[PDB]
Structure formats: structure tokens, C-alpha cells
Amino acid sequence: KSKFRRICVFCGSSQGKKSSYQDAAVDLGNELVSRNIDLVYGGGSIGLMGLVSQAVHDGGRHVIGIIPKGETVGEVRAVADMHQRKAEMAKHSDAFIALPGGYGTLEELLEVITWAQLGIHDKPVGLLNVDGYYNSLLSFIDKAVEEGFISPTAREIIVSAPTAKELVKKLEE
Amino acid sequence: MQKSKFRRICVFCGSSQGKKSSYQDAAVDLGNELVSRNIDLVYGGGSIGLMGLVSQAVHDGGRHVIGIIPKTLMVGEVRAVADMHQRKAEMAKHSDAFIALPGGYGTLEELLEVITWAQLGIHDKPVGLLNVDGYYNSLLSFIDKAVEEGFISPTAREIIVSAPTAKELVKKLEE
Numbered sequence: 001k002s003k004f005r006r007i008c009v010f011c012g013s014s015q016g017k018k019s020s021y022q023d024a025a026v027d028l029g030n031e032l033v034s035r036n037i038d039l040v041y042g043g044g045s046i047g048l049m050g051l052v053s054q055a056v057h058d059g060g061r062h063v064i065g066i067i068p069k070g071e072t073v074g075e076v077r078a079v080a081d082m083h084q085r086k087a088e089m090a091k092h093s094d095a096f097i098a099l100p101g102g103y104g105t106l107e108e109l110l111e112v113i114t115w116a117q118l119g120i121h122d123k124p125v126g127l128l129n130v131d132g133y134y135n136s137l138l139s140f141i142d143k144a145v146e147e148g149f150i151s152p153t154a155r156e157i158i159v160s161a162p163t164a165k166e167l168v169k170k171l172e173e
Numbered sequence: 174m175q176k177s178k179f180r181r182i183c184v185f186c187g188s189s190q191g192k193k194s195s196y197q198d199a200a201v202d203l204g205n206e207l208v209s210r211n212i213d214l215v216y217g218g219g220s221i222g223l224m225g226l227v228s229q230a231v232h233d234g235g236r237h238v239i240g241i242i243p244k245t246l247m248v249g250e251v252r253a254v255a256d257m258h259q260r261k262a263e264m265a266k267h268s269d270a271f272i273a274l275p276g277g278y279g280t281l282e283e284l285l286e287v288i289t290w291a292q293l294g295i296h297d298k299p300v301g302l303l304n305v306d307g308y309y310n311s312l313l314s315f316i317d318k319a320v321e322e323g324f325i326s327p328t329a330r331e332i333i334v335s336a337p338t339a340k341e342l343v344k345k346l347e348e
């Protein structure tokens with residue numbers, strides 16, 4: 001049995017131009033279903049977001065979408081604002097994984113990393129770096145670990161892998 | 174004869190001062206740019222790393238400085254709010270634009286949050302990067318990618334303004 005009851009997945013509300021990223025989202029969803037882990041997410045039915053949330057739901061697992069202020073599958077939670085949204089999503093998950101996404105996923109994925117670095121939480125954090133999507137952002141962190149702004153230890157907060165299967169294999173340890 | 178359209182700008186940055194003095198000079202020049210433009214500061218609230226260099230530079234220059242700190246722990250004014258989220262909200266509400274000097278996870282998260290809100294149209298405050306010796310080059314390239322793969326609209330990439338010096342950066346923010 002997985003040490004996680006729920007994993008908060010941040011990802012593209014857009015589907016992207018490559019079916020490769022779309023298949024990853026679906027696979028990640030099936031990985032949660034198989035490992036008996038439920039899904040926490042930002043809600044809605046659009047983009048890689050829809051796929052994984054629908055994939056997890058279709059597989060029979062529980063899905064919770066937390067929105068601020070398309071349709072959200074599973075249990076929906078509407079909160080005050082985007083701050084409360086990130087507050088809530090992070091207060092009910094046992095790990096955070098980001099799939100390729102845009103500014104949205106970045107910020108959320110970074111606040112959580114900053115929170116894990118500051119001690120606020122120690123949940124694992126992972127990047128599903130498919131087709132090299134996150135390569136640069138991943139080198140920038142290194143540029144940040146080289147110049148003196150991020151410690152080699154905090155850099156390790158970021159777990160990465162090219163596929164959902166292997167990716168979860170690392171978070172579980 | 175010159176007036177900036179900014180009552181105050183918010184500055185985020187590295188808890189450290191970076192390994193290159195070129196980064197420290199950029200934080201000093203940035204504060205001297207705000208002063209030279211009669212722009213006050215909206216920053217965190219410490220005396221270490223780059224934060225200290227830019228806030229003290231603005232203070233010495235005789236401009237107003239406001240630093241918001243989470244009341245958890247513990248120049249110019251000092252405010253303490255409940256949590257880290259209320260911190261960003263105040264800092265964002267009390268400033269006209271946003272700029273980032275080199276920094277780590279926290280700086281990058283403060284930045285992506287205000288940039289993301291501009292994307293959603295919540296606010297229209299300019300956001301800029303003080304690119305010291307190419308520090309953010311790879312971040313700018315990742316975004317370029319996040320534009321080619323269809324996750325960041327061609328226009329949303331233009332939210333991030335950037336330049337190698339504080340003067341060159343504030344001119345771009347002015348528009």
C-alpha cells in the first residue's frame with residue numbers, strides 16, 4: 001500500500017501541442033488508480049487537467065478539485081480566493097507532483113517547494129519531465145544552486161523523472 | 174525634469190547576496206534607480222542578502238520603504254501580518270509594479286504568483302526581471318518553451334519584462 005492517501009497534481013489547463021504530454025497525464029492518472037491513491041487537483045475539465053482527473057475518476061478513485069471564488073469531476077471545493085485554493089490543496093494532500101504546465105503550475109509548484117524548504121511541510125515534490133519539457137527550468141534551479149541562492153540540499157526537494165510510473169517510484173522512495 | 178508613473182514598486186530577492194559582486198551592485202543600483210525616480214520601496218523586511226542592499230539603498234536615498242513580515246517570527250516602516258499569504262497580498266496591494274532581483278525558490282514563487290495574476294487579468298501592474306549576468310536566462314528560455322508547446326499564450330509571455338540594469342528595466346516597465 002502507498003504511503004500516500006492523496007497526491008495533489010498541478011498541470012496544464014491547456015492540452016499542449018503534443019499528444020506525448022496528453023498520454024503522460026492519462027498514465028499518471030492510471031498510476032494513482034493502480035497504486036490506490038486518490039487525486040487532489042485544481043478542478044475543471046480542460047487540458048491535461050481534464051485527462052488525469054477524468055482518468056482517476058474513470059478508474060474508480062476519489063477526485064477532489066479545489067477552485068477559487070468547465071466542470072470539475074468528483075468532489076468539488078470552492079474556496080475564498082487563489083490563496084485559499086493553494087492553501088486548501090496543500091493542506092489535504094500527501095505529496096505534490098507537477099506535469100508540464102504554464103505559469104499556473106509553476107507558481108503553485110514553487111510555493112510548495114518554498115514551503116518544503118522553509119519547514120512548513122515535508123511532503124515529497126515531483127516533476128514529470130516528459131520530452132524534456134521542464135529541462136531549462138530544471139537548469140535554472142541549478143543556476144540557482146551554483147550562484148549561491150539555493151542550497152544543494154534544498155535542490156534535492158525537486159524529484160524528477162521522464163515517466164509517471166518511474167516518477168512515482170521515486171517519491172515513494 | 175522626469176517623473177515615473179510608479180508610486181512604489183515591490184522588490185523580491187535572494188536571502189543570500191550571491192557569489193558575484195555584480196549581483197550586489199545590481200541591488201544597490203536598483204534602489205538608487207527608484208530613489209532617482211522618486212519611487213518608494215515595497216519589499217520583505219530583513220537586513221541580509223540582496224533585500225538589505227536594495228532597501229537600505231532606498232532608505233539612504235531618502236525614500237520611503239515598507240517591508241511586510243509574517244508575524245510568526247519576531248530602515249523605513251515595518252509591518253507584520255498573520256501568514257505568508259497575507260504578506261504577499263499586502264505587498265501586492267500596496268505597490269504599483271513588481272521587479273525581481275536574483276533569488277531562490279521564494280523569490281521565484283513571489284514572482285510567478287504576481288506574473289500569473291497578471292495573466293488572469295486580476296491586476297495590471299508591470300512585472301520585471303533584473304537579469305544580473307544572465308541569472309534568469311534559462312527561466313526565460315523555459316517560458317519560451319512553455320510558449321511553443323501551447324501552455325503560455327504568445328502574449329502572456331510578454332508579461333515578463335526584463336533588462337540587465339535597473340535603469341534599463343524601469344524604463345521598460347514605464348512602457
Ligand SMILES: [Mg+2]
Nearest residue numbers: 121122123124
Ligand atoms: Mg519527505
